[PDB]
Write an enzyme that holds these catalytic residues in place. Structure first.
Site, PDB file in Angstrom:
ATOM      1  CB  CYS A  87      -1.127  -0.009   1.114  1.00  0.00           C
ATOM      2  SG  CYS A  87      -2.197   1.515   1.021  1.00  0.00           S
ATOM      3  CB  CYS A 127      -1.070   2.968   4.409  1.00  0.00           C
ATOM      4  SG  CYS A 127      -2.858   3.081   4.713  1.00  0.00           S
TER       5      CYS A 127
END
Length: 113
Positions: free
Chosen positions: A38, A41
């Site tokens: 990710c 993130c």
């Protein structure tokens, strides 16, 4: 010098940290549910640290979802990626979206209350 602390998390040892801080201690506690795959993130992890220096009342922790899906899913995590809110009176809140201004707004409302 007083601040929140983002701690990374892996196994049943986070069951000790998350639960026992939340239901045990007079504080808010805030946890991202993210796969290590990710890049959204990856920017958010620094965002969650700058916000931490802003906000003392409130512990900060982050779970690898691939490691600990049984529990991630229980809190409520059908989707990448989900910030939880657990205080000295069970699950307060749930919100799922990497956003720079989002998180600071969310905690501000929560940590005031």
């Amino acid at each position: 010098a007083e601040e929140g602390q983002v701690i990374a998390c892996h196994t049943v040892d986070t069951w000790k940290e998350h639960f026992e801080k939340g239901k045990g201690s007079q504080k808010l506690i805030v946890v991202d549910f993210t796969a290590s795959w990710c890049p959204p993130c990856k920017m958010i992890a620094p965002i969650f640290a700058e916000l931490a220096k802003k906000f003392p009342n409130v512990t900060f922790l982050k779970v690898d979802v691939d490691e600990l899906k049984a529990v991630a899913e229980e809190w409520n995590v059908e989707a990448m990626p989900t910030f939880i809110f657990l205080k000295d009176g069970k699950l307060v809140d749930k919100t799922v979206g990497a956003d720079k201004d989002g998180l600071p707004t969310l905690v501000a409302k929560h940590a005031t209350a």
